[PDB]
Design an enzyme around this catalytic site. Structure first.
Site, PDB file in Angstrom:
ATOM      1  N   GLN A 211      25.202  32.337   9.757  1.00  0.00           N
ATOM      2  CA  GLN A 211      25.389  31.647   8.484  1.00  0.00           C
ATOM      3  C   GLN A 211      24.725  32.409   7.344  1.00  0.00           C
ATOM      4  O   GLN A 211      25.362  32.717   6.330  1.00  0.00           O
ATOM      5  CB  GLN A 211      24.843  30.221   8.573  1.00  0.00           C
ATOM      6  CG  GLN A 211      24.857  29.483   7.241  1.00  0.00           C
ATOM      7  CD  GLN A 211      24.655  27.990   7.392  1.00  0.00           C
ATOM      8  OE1 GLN A 211      25.360  27.328   8.154  1.00  0.00           O
ATOM      9  NE2 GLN A 211      23.685  27.450   6.664  1.00  0.00           N
TER      10      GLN A 211
ATOM     11  N   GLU B 164      30.455  30.533  15.417  1.00  0.00           N
ATOM     12  CA  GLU B 164      30.974  29.226  15.071  1.00  0.00           C
ATOM     13  C   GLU B 164      31.768  29.378  13.779  1.00  0.00           C
ATOM     14  O   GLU B 164      31.372  30.171  12.909  1.00  0.00           O
ATOM     15  CB  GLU B 164      29.811  28.238  14.910  1.00  0.00           C
ATOM     16  CG  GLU B 164      30.124  26.949  14.216  1.00  0.00           C
ATOM     17  CD  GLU B 164      29.535  26.920  12.832  1.00  0.00           C
ATOM     18  OE1 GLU B 164      30.161  26.335  11.935  1.00  0.00           O
ATOM     19  OE2 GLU B 164      28.441  27.487  12.644  1.00  0.00           O
TER      20      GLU B 164
ATOM     21  N   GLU C  96      18.757  59.008   3.054  1.00  0.00           N
ATOM     22  CA  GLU C  96      17.773  59.134   1.986  1.00  0.00           C
ATOM     23  C   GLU C  96      16.896  57.895   1.858  1.00  0.00           C
ATOM     24  O   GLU C  96      15.767  58.002   1.369  1.00  0.00           O
ATOM     25  CB  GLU C  96      18.476  59.429   0.663  1.00  0.00           C
ATOM     26  CG  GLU C  96      17.545  59.909  -0.439  1.00  0.00           C
ATOM     27  CD  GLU C  96      18.285  60.592  -1.569  1.00  0.00           C
ATOM     28  OE1 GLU C  96      19.353  61.187  -1.307  1.00  0.00           O
ATOM     29  OE2 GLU C  96      17.797  60.535  -2.718  1.00  0.00           O
TER      30      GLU C  96
ATOM     31  N   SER D   2      19.760  36.571   9.693  1.00  0.00           N
ATOM     32  CA  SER D   2      18.516  35.825   9.585  1.00  0.00           C
ATOM     33  C   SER D   2      17.699  35.986  10.859  1.00  0.00           C
ATOM     34  O   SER D   2      18.244  36.208  11.943  1.00  0.00           O
ATOM     35  CB  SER D   2      18.777  34.335   9.330  1.00  0.00           C
ATOM     36  OG  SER D   2      19.512  33.750  10.394  1.00  0.00           O
TER      37      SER D   2
ATOM     38  N   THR E 273      16.059  25.304   9.381  1.00  0.00           N
ATOM     39  CA  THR E 273      16.754  24.240  10.087  1.00  0.00           C
ATOM     40  C   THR E 273      16.260  24.039  11.511  1.00  0.00           C
ATOM     41  O   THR E 273      16.622  23.036  12.136  1.00  0.00           O
ATOM     42  CB  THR E 273      18.264  24.524  10.115  1.00  0.00           C
ATOM     43  OG1 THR E 273      18.512  25.748  10.820  1.00  0.00           O
ATOM     44  CG2 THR E 273      18.810  24.645   8.700  1.00  0.00           C
TER      45      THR E 273
ATOM     46  N   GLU F  86      12.229  28.867  15.201  1.00  0.00           N
ATOM     47  CA  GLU F  86      12.538  30.090  14.470  1.00  0.00           C
ATOM     48  C   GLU F  86      11.471  31.173  14.641  1.00  0.00           C
ATOM     49  O   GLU F  86      11.819  32.362  14.657  1.00  0.00           O
ATOM     50  CB  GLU F  86      12.765  29.778  12.990  1.00  0.00           C
ATOM     51  CG  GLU F  86      14.021  28.950  12.751  1.00  0.00           C
ATOM     52  CD  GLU F  86      14.381  28.820  11.286  1.00  0.00           C
ATOM     53  OE1 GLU F  86      15.248  27.983  10.959  1.00  0.00           O
ATOM     54  OE2 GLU F  86      13.804  29.554  10.461  1.00  0.00           O
TER      55      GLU F  86
ATOM     56  N   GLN G 297      27.053  34.079   4.365  1.00  0.00           N
ATOM     57  CA  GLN G 297      26.987  33.501   3.027  1.00  0.00           C
ATOM     58  C   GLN G 297      26.347  34.464   2.032  1.00  0.00           C
ATOM     59  O   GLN G 297      26.737  34.500   0.859  1.00  0.00           O
ATOM     60  CB  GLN G 297      26.235  32.171   3.070  1.00  0.00           C
ATOM     61  CG  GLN G 297      26.924  31.128   3.935  1.00  0.00           C
ATOM     62  CD  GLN G 297      26.305  29.749   3.814  1.00  0.00           C
ATOM     63  OE1 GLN G 297      26.996  28.738   3.925  1.00  0.00           O
ATOM     64  NE2 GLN G 297      24.998  29.702   3.593  1.00  0.00           N
TER      65      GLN G 297
ATOM     66  N   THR H 254      22.350  32.906  16.249  1.00  0.00           N
ATOM     67  CA  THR H 254      23.301  34.003  16.123  1.00  0.00           C
ATOM     68  C   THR H 254      22.691  35.166  15.348  1.00  0.00           C
ATOM     69  O   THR H 254      22.775  36.320  15.780  1.00  0.00           O
ATOM     70  CB  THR H 254      24.581  33.517  15.439  1.00  0.00           C
ATOM     71  OG1 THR H 254      25.160  32.450  16.203  1.00  0.00           O
ATOM     72  CG2 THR H 254      25.587  34.655  15.314  1.00  0.00           C
TER      73      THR H 254
ATOM     74  N   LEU I  76      22.439  56.743   3.314  1.00  0.00           N
ATOM     75  CA  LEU I  76      21.528  55.915   4.096  1.00  0.00           C
ATOM     76  C   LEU I  76      20.365  56.728   4.653  1.00  0.00           C
ATOM     77  O   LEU I  76      19.271  56.188   4.852  1.00  0.00           O
ATOM     78  CB  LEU I  76      22.291  55.226   5.226  1.00  0.00           C
ATOM     79  CG  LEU I  76      23.428  54.306   4.782  1.00  0.00           C
ATOM     80  CD1 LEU I  76      24.151  53.715   5.979  1.00  0.00           C
ATOM     81  CD2 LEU I  76      22.893  53.209   3.873  1.00  0.00           C
TER      82      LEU I  76
HETATM   83  N1  LIG Z   1      18.684  32.792   2.111  1.00  0.00           N
HETATM   84  C1  LIG Z   1      19.464  32.130   2.958  1.00  0.00           C
HETATM   85  N2  LIG Z   1      18.940  31.677   4.145  1.00  0.00           N
HETATM   86  C2  LIG Z   1      19.726  31.004   5.015  1.00  0.00           C
HETATM   87  C3  LIG Z   1      21.059  30.760   4.732  1.00  0.00           C
HETATM   88  N3  LIG Z   1      21.587  30.073   5.772  1.00  0.00           N
HETATM   89  C4  LIG Z   1      20.617  29.885   6.698  1.00  0.00           C
HETATM   90  N4  LIG Z   1      19.463  30.447   6.234  1.00  0.00           N
HETATM   91  C5  LIG Z   1      18.168  30.497   6.916  1.00  0.00           C
HETATM   92  O1  LIG Z   1      18.390  31.067   8.187  1.00  0.00           O
HETATM   93  C6  LIG Z   1      17.702  30.346   9.189  1.00  0.00           C
HETATM   94  C7  LIG Z   1      18.742  29.788  10.157  1.00  0.00           C
HETATM   95  O2  LIG Z   1      19.678  30.810  10.435  1.00  0.00           O
HETATM   96  P1  LIG Z   1      21.271  30.562  10.406  1.00  0.00           P
HETATM   97  O3  LIG Z   1      21.963  31.740   9.761  1.00  0.00           O
HETATM   98  O4  LIG Z   1      21.621  29.268   9.709  1.00  0.00           O
HETATM   99  O5  LIG Z   1      21.670  30.438  11.962  1.00  0.00           O
HETATM  100  P2  LIG Z   1      22.864  31.271  12.655  1.00  0.00           P
HETATM  101  O6  LIG Z   1      22.717  32.748  12.387  1.00  0.00           O
HETATM  102  O7  LIG Z   1      24.215  30.753  12.225  1.00  0.00           O
HETATM  103  O8  LIG Z   1      22.625  31.024  14.224  1.00  0.00           O
HETATM  104  P3  LIG Z   1      23.136  29.691  14.961  1.00  0.00           P
HETATM  105  O9  LIG Z   1      23.511  28.639  13.949  1.00  0.00           O
HETATM  106  O10 LIG Z   1      22.001  29.196  15.817  1.00  0.00           O
HETATM  107  O11 LIG Z   1      24.324  30.026  15.823  1.00  0.00           O
HETATM  108  C8  LIG Z   1      16.901  29.266   8.480  1.00  0.00           C
HETATM  109  O12 LIG Z   1      15.600  29.751   8.242  1.00  0.00           O
HETATM  110  C9  LIG Z   1      17.612  29.106   7.154  1.00  0.00           C
HETATM  111  O13 LIG Z   1      16.721  28.724   6.128  1.00  0.00           O
HETATM  112  C10 LIG Z   1      21.591  31.217   3.534  1.00  0.00           C
HETATM  113  O14 LIG Z   1      22.768  31.022   3.245  1.00  0.00           O
HETATM  114  N5  LIG Z   1      20.789  31.902   2.649  1.00  0.00           N
HETATM  115  C1  LIG Z   2      11.837  18.969  14.772  1.00  0.00           C
HETATM  116  O1  LIG Z   2      12.694  19.749  13.987  1.00  0.00           O
HETATM  117  C2  LIG Z   2      14.036  19.343  14.007  1.00  0.00           C
HETATM  118  C3  LIG Z   2      14.373  18.010  14.295  1.00  0.00           C
HETATM  119  C4  LIG Z   2      15.711  17.616  14.313  1.00  0.00           C
HETATM  120  C5  LIG Z   2      16.736  18.562  14.032  1.00  0.00           C
HETATM  121  C6  LIG Z   2      16.405  19.869  13.749  1.00  0.00           C
HETATM  122  C7  LIG Z   2      15.043  20.269  13.732  1.00  0.00           C
HETATM  123  N1  LIG Z   2      17.478  20.861  13.461  1.00  0.00           N
HETATM  124  C8  LIG Z   2      18.857  20.577  13.817  1.00  0.00           C
HETATM  125  O2  LIG Z   2      19.748  21.330  13.612  1.00  0.00           O
HETATM  126  C9  LIG Z   2      19.068  19.187  14.480  1.00  0.00           C
HETATM  127  N2  LIG Z   2      18.146  18.204  14.037  1.00  0.00           N
HETATM  128  C10 LIG Z   2      18.644  16.916  13.595  1.00  0.00           C
HETATM  129  N3  LIG Z   2      19.736  16.415  14.159  1.00  0.00           N
HETATM  130  C11 LIG Z   2      20.228  15.238  13.772  1.00  0.00           C
HETATM  131 CL1  LIG Z   2      21.691  14.629  14.587  1.00  0.00          CL
HETATM  132  N4  LIG Z   2      19.675  14.508  12.810  1.00  0.00           N
HETATM  133  C12 LIG Z   2      18.564  14.947  12.175  1.00  0.00           C
HETATM  134  C13 LIG Z   2      17.688  14.480  11.119  1.00  0.00           C
HETATM  135  C14 LIG Z   2      16.695  15.439  10.937  1.00  0.00           C
HETATM  136  O3  LIG Z   2      16.924  16.416  11.795  1.00  0.00           O
HETATM  137  C15 LIG Z   2      18.029  16.166  12.552  1.00  0.00           C
HETATM  138 MG   LIG Z   3      24.992  28.796  12.437  1.00  0.00          MG
END
Ligand SMILES: Nc1nc2c(ncn2[C@@H]2O[C@H](COP(=O)(O)OP(=O)(O)OP(=O)(O)O)[C@@H](O)[C@H]2O)c(=O)[nH]1
Ligand SMILES: COc1ccc2c(c1)NC(=O)CN2c1nc(Cl)nc2ccoc12
Ligand SMILES: [Mg+2]
Ligand SMILES: Nc1ncnc2c1ncn2[C@@H]1O[C@H](COP(=O)(O)OP(=O)(O)CP(=O)(O)O)[C@@H](O)[C@H]1O
Ligand SMILES: Nc1nc2c(ncn2[C@@H]2O[C@H](COP(=O)(O)OP(=O)(O)O)[C@@H](O)[C@H]2O)c(=O)[nH]1
Ligand SMILES: [Ca+2]
Ligand SMILES: [Mg+2]
Ligand SMILES: [Mg+2]
EC number: 3.6.5.-
Lengths: 54, 328, 437, 427
Positions: free
Chosen positions: C11, C71, C254, C140, C179, C183, C15, C145, C252
């Site tokens: 992601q 995904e 350099e 990230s 998220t 991490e 993005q 991923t 690259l």
């Molecule tokens: N700066 C920035 N950080 C992001 C972004 N999307 C996710 N993150 C950060 O990246 C971390 C999570 O990585 P993701 O890219 O969402 O996860 P992923 O690579 O898709 O891997 P999976 O979802 O587990 O399959 C978290 O610390 C987020 O704060 C974005 O669009 N910009």
């Molecule tokens: C302890 O840290 C956490 C705890 C829970 C999650 C995550 C991290 N991250 C996720 O992607 C899934 N998740 C969640 N899932 C779902 Cl259904 N509702 C919520 C509401 C807040 O968090 C949620």
């Molecule tokens: Mg993802």
């Protein structure tokens, strides 16, 4: 301050300023560790199905 | 409530600051390894400055200035004064000092010191004369310094002493000088004939273990020492000594300000310093060293620690003067 | 001319890639359909922008980019977005189930299924290159991923392209926007596996981009859109020398030569200024000295740390806008006297300057205001090890209890790979302290 | 990313029917399956819980299981009964008589294969199956005994899918029979091994909330299920709706479960409301945050101050300042950091959704993996031992082929679960 290697063009210019001088694993090994992890997954799933069979 | 942690149980100063903070009813102490703190009374060695200021929703503050060890180690203090233009090699209030690794630059001053036939007593840290004797002691990192052979001697007693001033630098880099100093005196009369006997030279409280003869605990405070200067020498502590002290403290801290200031950092810093001064025969002040984790005097713990909470902690975390501000 | 292929994983990578390619098109005058009216060499050419863009006979300018996510929903937004026509469908790759914030799930379980497909699509772009120099990887640390599948991809790229450089743009994890709770695990695991396969890695702490948006853009709760538009500006400044005419950082190789003396210590700190809000009605434009002086404030860095208590190994200044060499040297003279800038003894104390007269391009309707001159400083300082210290500490707290390790072992990983990766990080932290203290 | 829902037994189908009533209204679906909503956030992730049939109809991916036709007939005659696919109704005739053994070994064994046929038919139509969620009680016979039999057999056929359960814990305050501690201990033994996430919905907590807080003198099962359907709606918010946290069952398990056996969550909800009585003052964000962490709003009768939070997940629903949410959530963690384990950094993640539940403008749902959940199992292990030390009522089970040894093994495994939660409360 020594300004060296000054290069200029239409887009911009670049230079260097100095203030003071000084004082891999192969494809075979990757495929083996990727299959060693799948073997450990298969074994854990077999132990699960064996347990569920009992 | 505000939250703090204690990572130095051996600190007598901040042990009293823990009690004072807890007594307000607005400060809760956490465990050593709890990261959700407002304040850190951190360790003296290997303080993790890198982990400060990264907790969302918490203004974090620590009782040490990262990089201030350049001023609080004898080897680093000499290098800082010699190399910084703000203080410069011709610094009138720092004794001649040379860093020795267990030389050639030092031997020239000692050789001209023999050539001049003037005083050639140098201290290394322990006091010796001539030259080569001190070096063998270092091998069996040290700094050699010119031993002040003509110090101001209190009467009665013919005694040596050093002056300790406690300085607080807050998060805004205001420099605060505690109005109460202390003279750590020597209860043994000053003998310049032999330096092997160093109970009359080393003015440390531990060296003194004749102790306790003239004042309690070999501590002469400013009230009595100021009266002595009026009676004996027809002057005051403010004019004859304290102006040079305030100049030295201000000069040292303003030199390292760009390297340690936390004005625009993600965390904040304050620190209490201990400046040790040596007054000579002509009422001139000399800087011996700066101390990064200094202890106080029992009489002054209650007042000083109360001031640290008021000026350094409560200024950032307010609740529901004993300091002289050195202006810069 | 030598081509560069960009790869965006997960992601955060995809993005951010959308933000960069949106910005690149605005800078080079390329429209969402891929048409570049200023390009007079139809269907080909070896200009500087052809490093990042290929050309079709119809006049379309196709990015040399591949998007991969285990995904589909993020890349699906690219397939139907404003720049849907820009990319060919074959360079947008998606799976069905993601790595669920699990490094081992993205590296071993799900990654093994799709790794051979991605390398083929990457091979498709590479065969259009008369002289590939290497790759730019966007991902990230915290994503399953972005951490797991990237480390597997970086391993394979060293095999199939052993002579090519590889640069990373990595998102250091920040709890304010993170998220997942695991991490720190994913970060250490992917850094250990990728450390020897990357020649230069630009870390971007989301905590630093978050607070910059709050402080300098007046945004109370910044979103990924806010962060990614600011990040793309920095990334654009770093890659601008590859896409435009110049003599500094033209390939690259350099980047490694000018910024990375030690192969392991290849994490340059990026500082950018000025960041000015578009909502600011009245603004006094900043000078060369003011924005160069801003490069040494920690509040403007991509990673929060204190360079005064470290040592520099290299330092580049990349100016965009109305800048001339005379004003730069005047600014560097003042800054050297007022700030702690210590270089390692085995390196010359100096700066490599590059100036691009075209001022920074800002996307219309974005949060960033238009300025007259800007600068991005790239400095390899040992003070960036503070981020590894923070990261390894969080790793140590969880791993001491073996918390969440069962999720990784259940994917086929071995518990020993945890301590193996942590040992490498312990060595990396020790190398920084050797060089800097 | 589809989820297959299963409701087993009387309690499972009654809270399950209420759950589908609540979330169908939230997504704008009428009892006939026709979508008559206004916003498109209601349909963006609608496939997680609904199948799209002919004529733009939405059929819940739900399977209704019972050994009696009684409760399942009430569901089909209920307000939303016609929305359920009729082939997903699978029922016997003899019932289970509040007997775990009848549901797990004898009566339920006859019926479990036909349920798995409907399960398989729903899983084959799935683009990508996340897993399953089961609603059941642990004190009866069908939902407790046969429910765990289904979970065991679903895990055999789909070993790489997430098993989630909403499990109602029995309480003597709201008791049907005396053998409920027997059935619950036998069922918790199965849940510890064969599920990834279990929401512990304690009937004792639901009664105390109805009595002490909502001021209901004699609460009914309808009053208890109101709190359940509101909690079930809140915990599934991030699975049904889009936001920065777009989550699935696996990510929730990965982030909430640091050790596989410790996957029993304390649900919480604020503001606590009773049926047919609407309060008109909307709660401020500080009040939502204060109440959702209050023990009086917990759906499992455990004192959270008697333990420590391993992980916490929170959902805020409505129009509110997300900055004020971040400040208040950080305010709770920083003023009560002793109740959050320090060896899991940043163990509280908050999510926001703009759609509020029906009848409320702002709400907060709490999911807590606390070591204080052991008090629930300790309570059931005491009621179990009080009878088992005299082998009382065991003939109902040995008559169905069970041995006393199986009871000893379940009693032991639950005591191990309690001491395991105690391991991380001291650390
Ligand atoms: N700066 C920035 N950080 C992001 C972004 N999307 C996710 N993150 C950060 O990246 C971390 C999570 O990585 P993701 O890219 O969402 O996860 P992923 O690579 O898709 O891997 P999976 O979802 O587990 O399959 C978290 O610390 C987020 O704060 C974005 O669009 N910009
Ligand atoms: C302890 O840290 C956490 C705890 C829970 C999650 C995550 C991290 N991250 C996720 O992607 C899934 N998740 C969640 N899932 C779902 Cl259904 N509702 C919520 C509401 C807040 O968090 C949620
Ligand atoms: Mg993802
Ligand atoms: N250059 C000098 N000339 C004369 N006397 C000196 C001197 N340097 C040190 N002394 C004397 O020696 C004593 C101890 O020296 P020094 O201050 O370096 O050790 P120290 O670090 O243990 C004391 P503290 O740490 O408490 O400041 C001083 O108190 C002073 O009396
Ligand atoms: N909260 C709630 N609990 C219930 C309901 N119906 C039964 N129970 C509880 O579940 C237990 C009986 O389980 P039940 O569902 O009737 O058994 P089964 O139908 O044979 O599976 C008792 O402890 C009841 O307190 C209900 O509608 N709501
Ligand atoms: Ca062309
Ligand atoms: Mg000392
Ligand atoms: Mg019943």
């Amino acid at each position: 301050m020594e300004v060296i290697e000054l290069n200029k063009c239409t887009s911009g210019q670049s230079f260097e300023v100095i203030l003071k001088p000084p004082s891999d694993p192969s494809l075979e090994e990757i495929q083996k560790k990727l299959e060693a992890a799948e073997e450990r997954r298969k074994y854990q799933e077999a132990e699960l199905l064996k347990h569920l069979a009992e | 409530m505000y939250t703090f942690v204690v990572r130095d149980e051996n600190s007598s100063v901040y042990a009293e600051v823990s009690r004072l903070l807890l007594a307000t009813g607005q400060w809760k102490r956490l465990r050593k390894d709890n990261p959700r703190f407002n304040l850190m009374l951190g360790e003296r060695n290997r303080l993790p400055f890198g982990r400060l200021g990264h907790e969302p929703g918490l203004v974090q503050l620590v009782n040490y200035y990262r990089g201030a060890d350049k001023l609080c180690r004898k080897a680093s203090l000499v290098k800082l004064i010699k190399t910084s233009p703000e203080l410069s090699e011709s610094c009138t209030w720092f004794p001649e000092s040379y860093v020795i690794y267990p030389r050639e630059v030092f031997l020239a001053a000692y050789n001209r010191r023999r050539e001049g036939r003037e005083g050639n007593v140098w201290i290394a840290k322990l006091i010796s004369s001539e030259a080569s004797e001190l070096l063998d002691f270092i091998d069996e990192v040290h700094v050699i310094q010119k031993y002040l052979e003509k110090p101001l001697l209190l009467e009665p007693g013919h005694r040596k002493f050093d002056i300790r001033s406690w300085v607080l630098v807050d998060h805004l880099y205001n420099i605060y000088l505690y109005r109460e100093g202390v003279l750590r005196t020597s209860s043994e009369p000053y003998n310049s004939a032999n330096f092997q006997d160093k109970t009359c030279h080393l003015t440390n409280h531990c060296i003194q273990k004749n102790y306790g003869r003239y004042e309690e605990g070999n501590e002469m405070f400013f009230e009595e020492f100021n009266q002595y200067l009026m009676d004996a020498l027809n002057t005051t502590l403010e004019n004859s000594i304290l102006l040079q002290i305030k100049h030295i403290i201000r000069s040292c801290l303003m030199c390292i300000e760009p390297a340690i200031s936390t004005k625009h950092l993600h965390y904040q810093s304050f620190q209490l310093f201990g400046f040790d001064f040596m007054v000579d025969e002509e009422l001139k002040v000399w800087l011996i060293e700066v101390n990064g984790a200094p202890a106080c005097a029992q009489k002054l713990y209650a007042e000083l620690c109360q001031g640290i909470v008021d000026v350094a902690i409560s200024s950032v975390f307010p609740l529901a003067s004993i300091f002289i501000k050195l202006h810069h | 001319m030598r081509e560069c292929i960009s790869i965006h994983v997960g992601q955060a990578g995809v993005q951010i890639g959308n933000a960069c390619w949106e910005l690149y098109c605005l800078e080079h005058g390329i429209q969402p359909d891929g048409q570049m009216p200023s390009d007079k060499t139809i269907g080909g050419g070896d200009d500087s922008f052809n490093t990042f863009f290929s050309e079709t006979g119809a006049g379309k300018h196709v990015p040399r980019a591949v998007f991969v996510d285990l995904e589909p929903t993020v890349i699906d937004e690219v397939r139907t977005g404003t720049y849907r026509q820009l990319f060919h469908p074959e360079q947008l790759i998606t799976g069905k189930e993601d790595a669920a914030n699990n490094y081992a799930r993205g590296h071993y379980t799900i990654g093994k299924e799709i790794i051979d497909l991605v390398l083929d699509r990457i091979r498709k772009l590479a065969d259009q290159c008369t002289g590939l120099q290497g790759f730019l990887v966007f991902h990230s640390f915290g994503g399953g991923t972005g951490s797991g599948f990237t480390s597997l991809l970086m391993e394979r790229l060293s095999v199939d392209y052993g002579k090519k450089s590889k640069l990373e743009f990595s998102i250091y994890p920040a709890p304010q926007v993170s998220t997942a709770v695991v991490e720190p695990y994913n970060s250490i695991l992917t850094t250990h596996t990728t450390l020897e396969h990357s020649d230069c890695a630009f870390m971007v702490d989301n905590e630093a981009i978050y607070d910059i948006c709050r402080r300098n853009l007046d945004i109370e709760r910044p979103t990924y859109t806010n962060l990614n538009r600011l990040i793309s500006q920095i990334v654009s400044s770093i890659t601008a020398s590859l896409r435009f005419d110049g003599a500094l950082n033209v390939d690259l190789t350099e980047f490694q030569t000018n910024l990375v003396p030690y192969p392991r210590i290849h994490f340059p700190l990026a500082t950018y200024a000025p960041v000015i809000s578009a909502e600011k009605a009245y603004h006094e434009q900043l000078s060369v000295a003011e924005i160069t002086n801003a490069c040494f404030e920690p509040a403007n860095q991509m990673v929060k740390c204190d360079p005064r208590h470290g040592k520099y190994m290299a330092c580049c200044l990349l100016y965009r806008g109305d800048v001339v060499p005379k004003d730069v040297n005047a600014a560097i003279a003042t800054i050297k006297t007022k700030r702690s800038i210590q270089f390692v003894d085995w390196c010359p104390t100096g700066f490599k300057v590059g100036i691009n007269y075209q001022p920074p391009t800002v996307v219309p309707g974005g949060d960033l205001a238009k300025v007259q001159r800007a600068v991005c400083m790239l400095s390899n300082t040992t003070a960036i090890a503070e981020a590894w210290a923070r990261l390894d500490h969080k790793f140590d707290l969880m791993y001491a209890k073996r918390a969440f390790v069962h999720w990784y072992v259940g994917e086929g990983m071995e518990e020993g790979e945890f301590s193996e990766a942590r040992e490498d990080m312990a060595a990396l932290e020790k190398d920084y302290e050797e060089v800097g203290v | 990313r589809e989820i297959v829902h299963i409701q087993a037994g009387q309690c499972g189908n009654q809270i399950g029917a209420k759950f589908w009533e609540v979330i169908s209204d939230e997504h704008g679906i009428d009892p006939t399956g026709s979508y008559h909503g206004d916003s498109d956030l209601q349909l963006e992730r609608i496939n997680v819980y609904y199948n799209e049939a002919t004529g733009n109809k939405y059929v819940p991916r739900a399977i209704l299981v019972d050994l009696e036709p009684g409760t399942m007939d009430s569901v089909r005659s209920g307000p939303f009964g016609q929305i359920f696919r009729p082939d997903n109704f699978v029922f016997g005739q003899s019932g289970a008589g509040n007997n775990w053994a009848k549901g797990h070994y004898t009566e339920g064994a006859e019926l479990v294969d036909s349920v798995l046929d409907v399960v398989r038919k729903e899983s084959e139509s799935c683009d990508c199956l996340q897993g399953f969620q089961l609603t059941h009680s642990l004190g009866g016979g069908t939902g407790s005994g046969m429910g765990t039999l289904l979970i065991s057999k679903i895990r055999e056929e789909y070993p790489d899918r997430i098993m989630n359960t909403f499990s109602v814990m029995p309480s003597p305050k709201v008791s049907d029979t005396v053998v409920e501690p027997y059935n619950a201990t036998l069922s918790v033994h199965q849940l510890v091994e064969n599920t990834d996430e279990t929401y512990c919905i304690d009937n004792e907590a639901l009664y105390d909330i109805c009595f002490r807080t909502l001021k209901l003198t004699t609460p009914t099962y309808g009053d208890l299920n109101h709190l359940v359907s509101a909690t079930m709606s809140g915990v599934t918010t991030c699975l049904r709706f889009p936001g920065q946290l777009n989550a699935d069952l696996r990510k929730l398990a990965v982030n909430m479960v640091p050790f596989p056996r410790l996957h029993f969550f304390m649900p919480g909800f604020a503001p606590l409301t009773s049926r047919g009585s609407q309060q008109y003052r909307a709660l401020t964000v500080p009040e939502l945050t204060q109440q959702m962490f209050d023990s009086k709003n917990m759906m499992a009768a455990c004192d959270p101050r008697h333990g420590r939070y391993l992980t916490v997940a929170a959902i805020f629903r409505g129009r509110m300042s997300m900055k004020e949410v971040d400040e208040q959530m950080l305010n709770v963690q920083n003023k009560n950091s002793s109740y959050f384990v320090e060896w899991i950094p940043n163990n509280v993640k908050t999510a926001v959704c703009d759609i509020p539940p029906r009848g409320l403008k702002m709400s907060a749902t709490f999911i807590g993996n606390s070591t204080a959940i052991q008090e629930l199992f300790k309570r059931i292990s005491e009621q179990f031992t009080a009878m088992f030390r005299r082998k009382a009522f065991l003939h109902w089970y040995t008559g169905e082929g069970m041995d006393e040894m199986e009871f000893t093994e379940a009693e032991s495994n639950m005591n191990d679960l309690v001491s395991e939660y105690q391991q991380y409360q001291d650390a």
